[PDB]
Symmetry: D2
Subunit: 246 residues, 4 copies
């Protein structure tokens, strides 16, 4: 009777922000939910405790997205714990600020490893477990397709990479019945992008309706895509950005 009755999900980067909202919403819709995190162990356990209080199974796994072995092992741990896997949400991500002149190799490698390679590795590992009706969603960005200012180029490249990955992976997994999609948030009130931050006025100015998005609304859209009326949504990008990309 739950929209996600019996479903088994992993949300990377689920301790805070958009990922925590997604984890809570999938649980609210009926799924058992695992999350990964890098450092926020207390906050991750609190997400888990809240999901368990609903009567769901939940686990939090410390797994550095930059480490492909940790990512692959986290996916396998979820499938072992829950008996299988139905939903993967690749959400953990970083935004390294800086000018072109100042860009470091460490920032390039960190961004490509966390924002791109971890998505590829988790997707491949999840595909070993997912069956017909399984769902993969990744968190992109409105910046993947429209870059309004300087200082965003490395991040934009990392999110644009996920568009090609998503469309190709939908072809790879089509015969097995697994959909692959990307949700592109615009400005969304989180620790990465606080609505009271110094740059928030400029970000609101780009929107058609000038209001930061809610993480819970991004989560609602992810939950629709991975839910019982989302089966024909596949290989595509869904932008929730207040009209910034109009």
């Amino acid at each position: 009777m739950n929209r996600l009755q019996g479903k088994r999900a992993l949300v990377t980067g689920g301790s805070r922000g958009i990922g925590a909202a997604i984890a809570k919403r999938l649980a609210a819709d009926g799924a058992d939910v695992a999350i990964t995190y890098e450092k926020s162990a207390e906050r991750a356990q609190a997400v888990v405790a809240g999901i368990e209080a609903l009567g769901r199974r939940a686990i939090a796994i410390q797994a550095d997205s930059a480490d492909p072995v940790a990512v692959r092992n986290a996916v396998d741990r979820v499938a072992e714990a829950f008996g299988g896997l139905d939903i993967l949400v690749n959400n953990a991500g970083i935004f390294r600020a800086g000018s072109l002149d100042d860009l470091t190799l460490d920032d390039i490698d960190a961004t490509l490893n966390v924002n791109v390679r971890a998505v590829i590795v988790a997707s491949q590992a999840a595909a070993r477990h997912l069956g017909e009706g399984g769902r993969i969603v990744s968190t992109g960005s409105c910046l993947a397709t429209r870059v309004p200012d300087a200082g965003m180029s490395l991040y934009a490249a990392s999110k644009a990479a996920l568009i090609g990955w998503t469309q190709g992976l939908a072809r790879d997994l089509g015969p097995r019945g697994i959909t692959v999609n990307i949700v592109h948030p615009g400005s969304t009130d989180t620790d990465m992008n606080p609505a009271d931050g110094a740059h928030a006025d400029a970000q609101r100015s780009r929107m058609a309706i000038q209001q930061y998005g809610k993480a819970d609304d991004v989560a609602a859209l992810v939950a629709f895509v991975v839910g019982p009326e989302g089966r024909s949504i596949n290989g595509t990008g869904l932008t929730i950005d207040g009209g910034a990309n109009a």
Copy 2:
């Protein structure tokens, strides 16, 4: 109810995707008006089913090709329901034919029904919609990807709605009305039956080769115009089985 008290107009709501949209908005709590061209009995059956849920519903005969009829239909719904919160521009036609055989009548009918009617209804709705109002149009996966011959006029008509949607989101931003487009792929309807002559070729283009359900297209429209869709704006949402991957 997710759409408690909302007042909606779905053009071309007598059959197909539009009937599914009208039924879903009503199931979610909205009062729903539909237009139709000729299917008076089917339209009234849609209306009767919505009334049976306890909602208000009306069906207005209004030829999308006639811009006066379209504008009047929008105003008549606002009069009948007291206001208007949601406009879904869904009525559309697909005139089959080769480039060689393309007629002026087909060009005019397609542009008038699939484009001009959307512009006219959107403008009229903008005189009524308040803060939090929602406009959605039905596009097509063919608006951005055209796989074969014989689709060019139709693809042009749907691509036009992309520019309209993005610009209109800018126009209506200060008033707080979102404007979006939902692009179906192959969806089992009278226009595109899943047992039709072209249906194998259409399925072959998808990642998961099954025609879509009109009810799922309706579910996505209902999400966009609902209480968690306020930040979805100026954008296209494709539900096509992966055809455009």
Copy 3:
């Protein structure tokens, strides 16, 4: 000559981007016809300059809003030149105004001139074009990205041409005719003067803040229709100073 022996028609060739395209195709070797609506003096000056190069050239008054005039103009050029190799759909209008003030006349004029004329001329030209023929239309960076209010009808009309272009490339593929769209950004013309009141705002959207030259737009069109453009097909080429980045 890059376009030695080629036979071209550029709609709206009396001034602006169209005149620049006409002059460049002629400079590259082509015989060139142009259409215009009212600017007989400026059209004749374009023709006289092309004739001074030694090419054939004609100017046809042909209202793009009249489908019969458009078809007949295409047929007249093919008859006069003995054939047709290149069609450039460039004539267009930009009706300024708010959504509230948008008139049915504005809607019809924009769809008729900016969309229907392109479809009609393309179909007419396809009766004359052969293997190696080329169709290009003038789009706009606004077709895919609309930054402000007041542009929605125009953006819709240019976005329509993307779907048309991609579908027509499929239609004409077996016959070896490419179909492409060039999307200018802010380009210094009577429609969009670089020293105008709103030109500062348009420059601010660009990466390099300088209006484009009509002659550079013409250079890109000339590349697409020339001897190294055969594999450019079904696509949009944007020349907008980075506005759409």
Copy 4:
């Protein structure tokens, strides 16, 4: 000479599209450096041909997967030529294989060569480029449309360059340097031979079913970086025979 006095670096210039670009920039008047990984004989033959035109040319073994080597290659060219005007990021790999079989070595090699090397070279070149400088990268029609299984890592690596290109155009706007991406479709090279096993399937996706010529891709790159390309910026130019229509 359209590129009189210009000083260019083409990564992966020993074979294929890169060799064609290097040769075309030299034919247009530029001094040209190339990088290569292992084809020393081929690289020296490209250099010798350019020198026979009267231009300066150098070949540098520089593994794109090594960011220090990439940065050093850019600095070496700028030192040898006295400056730098044009950077073409062309070196790339396509690791064939299924999702099931994808290795971490494949993932790392593809991201290092196809993405990180472009970022590193672009940043290094920006220390030498001045007003009027040009950066172009070789993308792929697969960056935006993926028709089959087995392409997903590669498609991701080329899609990455679209976001890089648009963002870097913003970064380098105040300095007057344009940044663009040219997306070839099926182009007859060692990576994608026109008589290879998958070549029939690739031709079947096109509107005009013939593999592209590397020299035509080079001609389009040469246009973008030349004297009429100043307003082409932050954009993708696809040369794919209509595959992406």
